Design an enzyme around this catalytic site. Structure first.
Site, PDB file in Angstrom:
ATOM      1  N   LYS A 139       0.625 -13.424   5.216  1.00 38.09           N
ATOM      2  CA  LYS A 139       1.376 -12.202   4.827  1.00 38.09           C
ATOM      3  C   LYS A 139       2.891 -12.455   4.727  1.00 38.09           C
ATOM      4  CE  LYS A 139      -1.951  -9.115   7.028  1.00 38.09           C
ATOM      5  NZ  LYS A 139      -2.267  -8.289   8.206  1.00 38.09           N
TER       6      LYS A 139
ATOM      7  N   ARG B  79       5.646  -6.478   4.272  1.00 39.99           N
ATOM      8  CA  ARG B  79       6.096  -7.523   3.309  1.00 39.99           C
ATOM      9  C   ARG B  79       7.575  -7.334   2.915  1.00 39.99           C
ATOM     10  NH1 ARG B  79       0.407  -7.804   2.238  1.00 39.99           N
ATOM     11  NH2 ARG B  79      -0.205  -6.977   4.287  1.00 39.99           N
TER      12      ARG B  79
ATOM     13  N   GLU C 258       0.787  -1.234   0.000  1.00 42.49           N
ATOM     14  CA  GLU C 258       0.000   0.000   0.000  1.00 42.49           C
ATOM     15  C   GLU C 258       0.801   1.257   0.000  1.00 42.49           C
ATOM     16  OE1 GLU C 258      -2.411   0.939   3.809  1.00 42.49           O
ATOM     17  OE2 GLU C 258      -1.930  -1.198   4.005  1.00 42.49           O
TER      18      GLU C 258
END
Ligand SMILES: O=C(O)c1ccccc1O
Ligand SMILES: O=C(O)c1ccccc1O
Ligand SMILES: [Mg+2]
Ligand SMILES: [Mg+2]
Lengths: 408, 411
Positions: free
Chosen positions: B401, B368, B217
């Site tokens: 994740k 990440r 994001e």
């Protein structure tokens, strides 16, 4: 032609006066702050009958029958008519207008599907002035018949969980022991509420009045706005109770999910008629205070596409997703399967159309009476997470917005 | 600076390999990699740097004239002076902002880690790869994600209990996974990228510290007066076949826990943007749609605004950071809970990577991602904890994740 101009807390009482001073004559009242509108009589009218099989136009020259293959085209023809263009038009749209426009079969009620009137006379209340243009409460037990309603909800919940649809508004009609004094209900009910619009209409021996919590639709120029409200708690205690109820509403997963499911449908609806990329949420899931209840509310807007008018927008947006369901046509069907009295004007729209705007208020928190019936109606948005007992209570919280203020 | 343009007659298959091969040649030099499609920007060395130390008490400008100590009265003002510096104007600036920038800005007390709070660097040399062309400017680890899952579960349990006691509404609790060795960055970039679909990719090495990752994001994008933020929150896997993944997508979209976790963060993002924008300009352009991110898919909403006349991109960043989706609600209480609950410094985890040029201020959220310095080598992932959270699910979520990075760590 402006006849008089007499120089705000007297607005309420004056309208009542007018309704009484000129009672048993056709009247239409609409509140859109900072103004009130009162239309009286009838210079031109489009009337669409209860089963959408006849369109009648009336003006001073007489009565005409218009082809009624499309009610929207009839409405467009009325608005373009020489007796109409440039005048404010007061309208009403019954629930089954949706099924008619949609090619969905339906059982006709008693009330017209659509009427639009240019009044003969008009008062406008604004800036502590009025401008004239010319040519005893009753007790209501909202618990009665609760168990039948919870069965209807449990049915809806079964259908959703089976995947027949996602959301449906199941409503209940509460018949009233006597006919009510409309002007006095208006005055008394109003001070008890903070609605987005108020209305009182008397036409052809039928009367309706209410405190609309939201707009179906507003069109100003090319900009279209819809205002879905979904998700409810009471605001029926002291400020502390009310404010705890507000925080609870904002963070309740069921209420939030109910809300967003409807906003996303309202977005898809506007996308069907608007310029690509123009559809935006201008206000996301804020709490709106509406008398006995407070709701999550969102404002969604777009810019109409070049080949789309306010009537195309209205036919897609109607009825409010938040008064019918998701997907809309499957919900409309479930409603006709599940409910046992015709909604008539309930969950329909009240319209005001003038030079600057097409304004359409949702018909909830309202009372209705004709020669046969006198009733109030409330429902609840049923989703997979609904509890029949909570939804009963929800209708009663909503009914408390109108029911305590019914004057005999 | 002198520049050269090269058309490489390379097939697409070979573009990512060529990039990480070049990174390989930067050996142990300080460097900065940033993918914003259609380009990869590689910066090498340092011409000019703004450095904010770990506790936020010292700002240092560094260039060929030497080191200058600036006043740390306002990090935003430092950052503004750097962008407006004769050395800097007209150049792409590569930036990193550490998690603790928040607490500091907000006059909240924090425990300092070892990494700087914020750095901005104009590199000495640059390479920009775009669809087989390059412009030059010059002068397999095995990682068990289940290990220690028990300790994390108790952290989640404690957050949940704290929320149920009314302390805050939402907090991101994360877990650091220590790694057995230092990783090979160019090989990690290459294998990790082709397994992901991130909003931005990054890698930097500066002053003995390194990080690489696939940002899911964007904290913020500003072009001229328009500020966009794209909060992501709410997760399911997409680790299966297209029908498994499609099922998980529908399930995400209609799950009341996920939908609530999402909207709570969007409304915080909207309120933040309203503090620095023209009244009525802040709207949601895209409400809660599913975004695919390598091993996971998330709900995302796109929110935009028009900056007020008294406000710039630095003002937007200060209010928007850290992501509500990385901190909590209310932000200050969530930052305090994170500091009391977590045992290792986040450093750059949940911080931001910046690419700033003429037109644009681009900021990507650091999740990440993999970190290594003189002391630690680790990955990190968390989960947004609300009243409805269960410790078992939230541990499983951290692992879904972690699977966007853990499987692709190369030695
Ligand atoms: O069910 C609701 O929460 C609701 C609230 C306002 C208007 C229509 C509705 O269905
Ligand atoms: O908890 C989540 O689902 C989540 C998803 C994306 C980014 C940050 C998050 O906390
Ligand atoms: Mg409801
Ligand atoms: Mg989550």
């Amino acid at each position: 032609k402006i006849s008089e101009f007499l120089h705000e807390e007297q607005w309420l009482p004056t309208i009542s006066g007018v309704l009484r001073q000129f009672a048993e004559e056709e009247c239409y009242v609409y509140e859109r702050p900072p103004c009130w509108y009162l239309g009286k009589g009838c210079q031109a009218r489009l009337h669409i009958n209860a089963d959408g099989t006849q369109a009648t136009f009336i003006d001073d020259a007489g009565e005409q029958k218009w082809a009624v293959d499309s009610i929207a085209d009839c409405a467009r023809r009325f608005m373009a008519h020489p007796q109409v263009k440039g005048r404010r038009v007061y309208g009403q749209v019954g629930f089954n207008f949706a099924a008619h426009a949609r090619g969905i079969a339906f059982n006709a009620g008693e009330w017209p599907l659509l009427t639009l009137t240019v009044p003969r006379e008009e008062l406008i209340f604004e800036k502590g002035n009025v401008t004239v243009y010319a040519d005893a409460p009753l007790a209501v037990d909202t618990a009665l018949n609760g168990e039948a309603y919870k069965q209807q909800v449990a049915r809806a919940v079964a259908e959703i969980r089976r995947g027949e649809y996602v959301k449906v508004i199941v409503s209940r009609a509460i018949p009233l022991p006597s006919r009510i004094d409309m002007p006095a209900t208006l005055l008394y009910g109003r001070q008890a509420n903070t609605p987005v619009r108020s209305f009182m209409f008397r036409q052809e021996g039928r009367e309706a009045l209410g405190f609309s919590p939201e707009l179906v639709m507003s069109v100003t120029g090319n900009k279209v706005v819809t205002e879905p409200l979904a998700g409810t708690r009471d605001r029926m205690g002291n400020p502390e109770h009310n404010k705890a109820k507000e925080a609870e509403l904002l963070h309740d997963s069921k209420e939030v999910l109910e809300h967003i499911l409807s906003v996303k449908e309202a977005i898809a609806e506007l996308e069907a008629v608007c310029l690509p990329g123009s559809v935006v949420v201008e206000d996301l899931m804020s709490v709106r205070q509406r008398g006995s209840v407070q709701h999550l509310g969102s404002g969604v807007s777009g810019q109409l596409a070049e080949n789309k008018d306010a009537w195309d927008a209205f036919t897609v947006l109607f009825p409010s997703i938040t008064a019918s369901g998701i997907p809309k046509n499957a919900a409309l069907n479930a409603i006709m399967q599940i409910e046992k009295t015709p909604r008539e004007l309930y969950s329909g729209a009240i319209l005001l159309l003038d030079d600057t705007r097409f304004d359409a208020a949702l018909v909830l928190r309202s009372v209705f009476q004709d020669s046969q019936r006198c009733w109030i109606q409330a429902g609840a948005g049923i989703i997979a997470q609904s509890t029949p007992e909570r939804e009963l209570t929800e209708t009663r919280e909503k009914l408390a917005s109108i029911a305590p203020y019914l004057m005999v």
